[PDB]
Scaffold this active site. Structure first.
Site, PDB file in Angstrom:
ATOM      1  N   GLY A   1      47.675  -0.625  34.821  1.00 47.60           N
ATOM      2  CA  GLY A   1      46.266  -0.795  35.101  1.00 47.60           C
ATOM      3  C   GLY A   1      45.943  -1.940  36.015  1.00 47.60           C
ATOM      4  N   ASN A   2      44.791  -1.827  36.665  1.00 51.64           N
ATOM      5  CA  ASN A   2      44.363  -2.811  37.642  1.00 51.64           C
ATOM      6  C   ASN A   2      42.880  -2.907  37.550  1.00 51.64           C
ATOM      7  OD1 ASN A   2      45.549  -4.563  39.481  1.00 51.64           O
ATOM      8  ND2 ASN A   2      46.391  -2.888  40.716  1.00 51.64           N
ATOM      9  N   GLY A   3      42.365  -4.114  37.727  1.00 51.38           N
ATOM     10  CA  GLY A   3      40.928  -4.280  37.759  1.00 51.38           C
ATOM     11  C   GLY A   3      40.538  -5.623  38.303  1.00 51.38           C
ATOM     12  N   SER A   4      39.230  -5.869  38.322  1.00 55.54           N
ATOM     13  CA  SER A   4      38.713  -7.162  38.756  1.00 55.54           C
ATOM     14  C   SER A   4      38.998  -8.219  37.686  1.00 55.54           C
ATOM     15  CB  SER A   4      37.213  -7.055  39.029  1.00 55.54           C
ATOM     16  OG  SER A   4      36.567  -6.377  37.958  1.00 55.54           O
ATOM     17  N   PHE A   5      39.438  -7.767  36.510  1.00 53.22           N
ATOM     18  CA  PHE A   5      39.782  -8.651  35.392  1.00 53.22           C
ATOM     19  C   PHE A   5      41.217  -9.164  35.474  1.00 53.22           C
ATOM     20  CE2 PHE A   5      40.304  -4.165  34.306  1.00 53.22           C
ATOM     21  CZ  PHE A   5      41.662  -4.106  33.980  1.00 53.22           C
TER      22      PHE A   5
ATOM     23  N   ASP B   1      29.709   0.563  29.227  1.00 53.36           N
ATOM     24  CA  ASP B   1      30.625   1.274  30.131  1.00 53.36           C
ATOM     25  C   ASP B   1      31.180   2.523  29.461  1.00 53.36           C
ATOM     26  OD1 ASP B   1      31.803   1.501  32.726  1.00 53.36           O
ATOM     27  OD2 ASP B   1      33.687   0.623  32.010  1.00 53.36           O
TER      28      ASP B   1
END
Ligand SMILES: O=C1Nc2ncccc2N[C@@H]1Cc1c[nH]c2ccccc12
Ligand SMILES: [K+]
Length: 344
Positions: A28-32, A142
């Site tokens: 996973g990837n995110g702005s977090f 969300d």
């Protein structure tokens, strides 16, 4: 190679302990930050590891919330620990690869719709977890098919990704550009900063509709176009309706438009109880929408309260009636509908 860390259990007493895991890979990837997938050396169980950069000065909302929650329809926080000039909070969650998004897509590429029985199951568990988190004053903010995790064998649904979640307090403003565009409540598009957990109910209705249609019901090209897509179905809202939403920005170019018949929106087969439920969730006026408990007690879910009901693979349905007093907090006398006598 094996990694050992000192982590505090998420639900247990605040006591740190050595925890070991192996077979780590990015999922996973995110702005977090990043989300990894590992296997606990002890249990052999699989977990997800959400790595989030944190600032010491301020507490993490998601961590504060995940330690409160203990529900069967919610992803569990196993442990949490810190890794190394910045510090990363690492949340160790239950790893459930299958999502409702993946399942719906599988059907829609096949040009067919998911069987109504699966829809009733998934939605009901969704309203349960929502009834649970809303009792604490917590809004997920969300809700979307990608954040609904599935066990295909048991058909158990678990809400996840509380990265946008927050405990709402009256008189304290909240961000309006939140939630996935397709599932974003109308008041949010109106820039409301004083909204309730009823926005999650909106998003939930969007999920239901998408499961009946095989595609998203409001496919906006922008934050504002999303409103037009809503209008193309619900028509234009009355001034009273807009007043209830409490918008930050008053108005848009859009002309008055009459609503489309709900019957016509969906496919000809589509069950009437489903449609009837959708109209009760997808209301302009936030106070008009159903509470997560009222939704569970809807006629749409009556098939699940039949004592003879089973899964399509012959197996028994999960615990759907094990309500806590915390869950029933919203409306206790609904227990005599939610809980069939055969289940008592
Ligand atoms: O808690 C969750 N567990 C998972 N397990 C398998 C697949 C996906 C999830 N999602 C949340 C963890 C998560 C939260 N945000 C994410 C972003 C990308 C990938 C994963 C995540
Ligand atoms: K710790």
């Amino acid at each position: 190679k094996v990694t050992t860390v000192v982590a505090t259990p998420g639900q247990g007493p605040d006591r740190p302990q050595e925890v070991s895991y192996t077979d780590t890979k990015v999922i996973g990837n995110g702005s977090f930050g990043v989300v990894y997938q590992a296997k606990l050396c002890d249990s052999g169980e699989l977990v997800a590891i959400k790595k989030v950069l944190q600032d010491k000065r301020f507490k993490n909302r998601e961590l504060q919330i995940m330690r409160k929650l203990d529900h069967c329809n919610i992803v569990r926080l196993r442990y949490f620990f810190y890794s190394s000039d910045e510090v990363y909070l690492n949340l160790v969650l239950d790893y459930v690869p299958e999502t409702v998004y993946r399942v719906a897509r599988h059907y829609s590429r096949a040009k067919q719709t998911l069987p109504v029985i699966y829809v009733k199951l998934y939605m009901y568990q969704l309203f349960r977890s929502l009834a649970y988190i809303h009792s604490f004053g917590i809004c997920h903010r969300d809700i979307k098919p990608q954040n609904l995790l599935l066990d295909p064998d048991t058909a158990v649904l678990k809400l996840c990704d509380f990265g946008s979640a927050k405990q709402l307090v009256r008189g304290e403003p909240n961000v309006s550009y939140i939630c996935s565009r397709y599932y974003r409540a109308p008041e949010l598009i109106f820039g409301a900063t004083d909204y309730t957990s009823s926005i999650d109910v909106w998003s939930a209705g969007c999920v239901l509709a998408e499961l009946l249609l095989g595609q998203p019901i409001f496919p906006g090209d922008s934050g504002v176009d999303q409103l037009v897509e809503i209008i193309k179905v619900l028509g234009t809202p009355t001034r009273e309706q807009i007043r209830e939403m409490n918008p930050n920005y008053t108005e848009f170019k859009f002309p008055q438009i009459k609503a489309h018949p709900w019957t016509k929106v969906f496919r000809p087969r589509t069950p009437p109880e489903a449609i009837a439920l959708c109209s009760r969730l997808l209301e302009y006026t936030p106070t008009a929408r159903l509470t997560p408990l009222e939704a569970c007690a809807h006629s749409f879910f009556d098939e699940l309260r039949d004592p003879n009901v089973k899964l399509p693979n012959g197996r028994d349905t999960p615990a759907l009636f094990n309500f806590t007093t915390q869950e029933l907090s919203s409306n206790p006398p609904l227990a005599t509908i939610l809980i069939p006598p055969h289940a008592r």
